[PDB]
Amino acid sequence: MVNRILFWTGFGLAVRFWQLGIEMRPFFNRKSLWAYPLFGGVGASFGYWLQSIDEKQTKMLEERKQAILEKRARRAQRQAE
Amino acid sequence: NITLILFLIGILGFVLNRKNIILMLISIEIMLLSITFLILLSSLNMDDIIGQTYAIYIIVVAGAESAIGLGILVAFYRLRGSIAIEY
Amino acid sequence: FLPEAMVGRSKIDEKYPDSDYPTLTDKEDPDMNGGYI
Amino acid sequence: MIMISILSLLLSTSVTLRRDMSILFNRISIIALAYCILHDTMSLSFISKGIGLHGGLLHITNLTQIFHIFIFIISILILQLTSFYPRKVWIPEYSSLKDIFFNKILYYRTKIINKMGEHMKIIEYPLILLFVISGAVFLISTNDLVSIFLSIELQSYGLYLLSTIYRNSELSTTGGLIYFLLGGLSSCFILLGTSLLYVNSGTTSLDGLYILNSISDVNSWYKPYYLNFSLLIFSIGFLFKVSAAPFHFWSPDVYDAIPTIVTTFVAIIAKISIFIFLLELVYYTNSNANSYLSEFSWTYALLISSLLSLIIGTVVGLTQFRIKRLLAYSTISHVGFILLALSVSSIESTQAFIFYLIQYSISNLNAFFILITIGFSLYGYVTNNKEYKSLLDKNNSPIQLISQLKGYFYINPLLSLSLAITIFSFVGVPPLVGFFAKQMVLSAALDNGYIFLSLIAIITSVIGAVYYLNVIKEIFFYSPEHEVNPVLNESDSNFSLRILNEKNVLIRSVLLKGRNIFISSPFSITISIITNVILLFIFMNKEWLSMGTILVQILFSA
Amino acid sequence: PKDAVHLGLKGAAVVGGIGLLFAAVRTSLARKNVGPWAIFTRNGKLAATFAAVGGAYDFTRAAAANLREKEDWVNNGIGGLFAGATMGLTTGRIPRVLGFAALTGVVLATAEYAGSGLRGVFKRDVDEYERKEFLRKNRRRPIEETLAEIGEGRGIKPPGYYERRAQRLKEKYGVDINPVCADPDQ
Amino acid sequence: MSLLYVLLIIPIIGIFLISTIDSFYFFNVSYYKKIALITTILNLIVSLIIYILFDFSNNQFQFIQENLDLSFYDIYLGVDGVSIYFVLLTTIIMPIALVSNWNSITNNIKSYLIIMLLLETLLLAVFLVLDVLLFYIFFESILPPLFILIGLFGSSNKVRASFYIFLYTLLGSLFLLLSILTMSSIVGTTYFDVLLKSSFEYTTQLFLFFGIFIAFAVKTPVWGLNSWLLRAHVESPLGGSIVLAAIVLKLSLYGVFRLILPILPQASLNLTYIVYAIGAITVLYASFSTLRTVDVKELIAYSSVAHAAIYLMGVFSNTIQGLEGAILLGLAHGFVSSGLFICAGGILYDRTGTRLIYFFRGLTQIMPLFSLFFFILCLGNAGTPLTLNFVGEFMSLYGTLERLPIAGMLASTSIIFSAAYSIYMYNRIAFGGSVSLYFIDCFRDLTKREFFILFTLVSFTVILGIYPSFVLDGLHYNISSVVYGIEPNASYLT
């Protein structure tokens, strides 16, 4: 249950909730209600960005593992002599 | 060898001094001169102008930090009226 | 160069008295029950 | 970009004497650092152990650039303290987007928002702030012995200036004197260590020193004892600047004496730059073959200091009653963990080192942010406690004693829980980010045979938890000594606020009270994001931990 | 073997020299004018105590090594036992004698068993990938290796338990094993 | 959304509604208590649905949800027989804990309910996680809510109590963490399905055993490491005490099944004579000590120590009977100790304001419903038959005797002293003269609330005492997987 957008949409929603509680300001006054879509919208944007970062990190880590078996192979093959 | 003895004199300034904070500022000046003198003599032995350049930037920086330290002392003394540690 | 109320062991002694931990003797507290007669 | 901003800010600052410009200059410094993040985000599209720059005097790595950005982000967050007034007036009739973006509100703000507070009248404060940043990022990117010395003085001299910039506080000038005097002694040991390297090796280049170290690590006439001994003297000066034991006495005094907002920057930024700099120097000087070199390795000074910091940080914090001295000792114990991870030079420990440094910087930032916010919140409260009245520099350090936090859970329960989460993250309670940081360091130390240090790390952690619990007990177990201000809510003490449109025409007129005076949004939001990162780390750990994994693989890439 | 007295003197000197260092700092940090000869007058006890603990510690471990004819972690803990005991003797409190002996002997023993990296951990100098893989997949082992560590019985009854069980009982009790048939027809 | 994840989500929704309902309605405190109670009821309803679907003879973890989005620290949930009944005990107990404090909090009610609801999610997570690090993360996550519960709602000495339970647990858990990290380093993973498949070397198993056992001994607790229980379980609020005794004591017991029996069987076999010496000592020293305890809740708290020693001896017996008896005794002690704390901390302490046994006498004369349930709970604490306490004690003690007879006999002696301290307390409170002359006001008998949180607890122990098969049927195949040994002619079929 680790969805980047759902989690980070909720994270932004939780940031607004905790913020209003810290200020001891009411959690839901109707004129301020635009903020939860805003906080959750910015939260969703951060997590679409984390999506692309995770994709590039996975590719780079996958590339590193190949280089590591590659290094072990040519060292082991050199020891065959 | 002289440079080493000078570093001890700057070191010994902190050992012998319980109450003179001005001597603490002076002992740093002695240490920094001792280290710069060592670099200068070594630069002469190794025919290296970079040693002289390094020493020039130490003189610049140690002169810059002396001014900051005196300014900090002046802001301190403006409120206290003494540079003496009660001990 | 700093005041006593900020660095002095004296304020620590007030905040943590040695008296807060009762030490006694078999003379006044033989039964180790705090002097309970 | 940091250098253009410093020069440009100075020119604009040079021709003004208006202290009402201070808040604006702080905001421009935030904007300037945002461009610095942009230019360094642009620079990460390459994989290399290092590219020497500018005649070989500087260098760039993926690690260097990541921690430039981190230093910039921490500095933007800290700069908020001097860029926004601590308190605001909020009402439901001025909460819509059409309101904030098309209408204006009017009231006598000066006393309410503390428009003329000392921390809002120092023109040059953001400028000295950027000078320290320049020293920190130059130290990260330093490739030469002379560059090392110049960058460390640049960062150090700025920190002395910041400790004294509140020139009318007797405490601040006293703290500035102490940091400069003991800091100047520390800089001699760095210059002495750098000089001893040059006089023996004949080079100021770190590249050349690593080559000399590498060939000499074989398994006669010029045996290279100088390298470990010089770096030992060189390292001692850097241990002072991170306040590592036994070189830590200055920081509980300096951190308590200087104002809290200044303490926030001074106690955070300097450790990041020195530790990152030390990390590379530990890697390239780490001998492989068990020869006579490894037995005199300078890195034992790091392992001894980690041991001594674990004990001093936790034991001495037990009796602290002033909140800022406790944080200073809490920091010393945490650099004990950081130094253990730096000393074990493993892939695992370097990942642990990288993660621990970032999460502790974020967490320590939260504690200072929460402490400043609690100070700004007590404006509408009064107390008759005789101890609080006898405090010095109450305006610079509103919260000075742990007893001042007594019953803060009844004054602001959710802000008190954010403090408790942060402090529980310091102890290492799962599933908080602080636990996962300590867990990685212990697993890496255990996997490298550091059993004895791992056992002392766990034992000192229980001792350290006692004074952490002691802060929490004051906030939650007792009723508060602070009462709400009667004259702020007395059924007739109401101040006026006007709501006006784009054409400065009246729309409404509302009468307001002290209960309409709230914490400013920048501080509540920053506390709220960081608190939730600490609490919810277990759901968000993949990218953050993968970054360090990749960084260490590049550093270790055979 | 080793010279117990000679090693103790080196032990007494090395950690007594640091006590002499700490004694000079007390004299230097002394407030009233006590002169330079208060190094051994007012703080000579401090330096003397250090020279005693370091002497007691290095004597006994060397002595424990001679008595046991072995070199292992046991000797440092034993060395730390008297080292800890010596410090307690200065306070003149028996619980201080035992407790500081216990503290020192335990830390100094786990330091040698674990081998704290304060001077550097031992480098394996082998393919460290391979050791982990062997430890990772050694999922089935010969039964003999387990039988050496855990033994026979206590619910561990490998095939052939009953035959050797009779032989063991005959050797110890001299009684033949022969359970009686439970069927009258047999 | 797996049923197991539903279990952890419901109490978090209740927290959300509790802390937001004021923005939709000054809201009455009764509302908060009703939201919290219904929240725990629906959590119980879900755990009952799971149990109907649960299969008694499967070696696969059941009701697991595929993640496949692997991260560094992922939460996998799954349930088998050894974990199914601990999950049920947590879901049954917590509603009773909520009702047991309905009237006795009266301040910071929102904080009490949020802490109580959070504790449910964490404790359930402990029994459901399929990873050894995941186990540790939840075993320790409960300390800060526990620390703040005692300090906010505890009795006069709640500061010393909250520190003791926090620091004891952390210090022991830090030694368990060291052992857990060594395991993950060697194996590369702490997931149950692949860590149990591995085989540790004997001396590794030996040092892994000490680290884990030091934590499980602080949490049992064993005698001499039990100061925290004496303080915390007495100074805690009644709901806290019920959760602390009936659920939190069980984590170390359930942890022996997942952390030492499968991976450290050689160490466990070779060190049983040390576990049994500590287990035997705890049975005697605790039993003698609670005979002289004058605080009624501390007497009842001290009984938990003696019984926890008996099922601690059972789990190390390597026998089918001991292991089943250990879970059944840990379950039985959950109901009975919960009732005895309601009797002491809830019924007596609300009427008198004191817990000293010196002030109570002849309560049967004015309170015959309290005495009727108190006696049945004093019988169950004494291991009387037709209570689930006897079936667990007899099976746990049989395994202890068979594995090592000298410890079995000594642990058997608890049949005398449990009876001794349980009946002696019962007489000094319910019998033993006429109503105590210290009471100025007369006392009322059980309220409907007190009657029905006791009738419920005495029903569970009695029905399970007559038909323990309800629980044993779902333990036979899974308990079998943790046994270590082989028979001469059944091993190695061909």
Ligand SMILES: CCCCCCCCCCCCCCCCCC(=O)OC[C@H](COP(=O)(O)OCCN)OC(=O)CCCCCCCCCCCCCCCCC
């Ligand atoms: C499955 C993984 C889950 C991971 C964690 C996910 C989140 C779990 C919960 C973390 C904290 C959530 C807090 C929820 C309550 C927030 C809402 C709130 O404001 O409650 C306010 C409440 C009462 O205060 P109030 O009503 O405003 O004042 C009235 C005075 N007459 O005041 C309170 O309720 C405060 C209650 C006491 C503090 C909570 C208990 C101790 C928590 C220690 C925090 C550090 C450890 C965090 C552990 C998280 C779970 C492991």
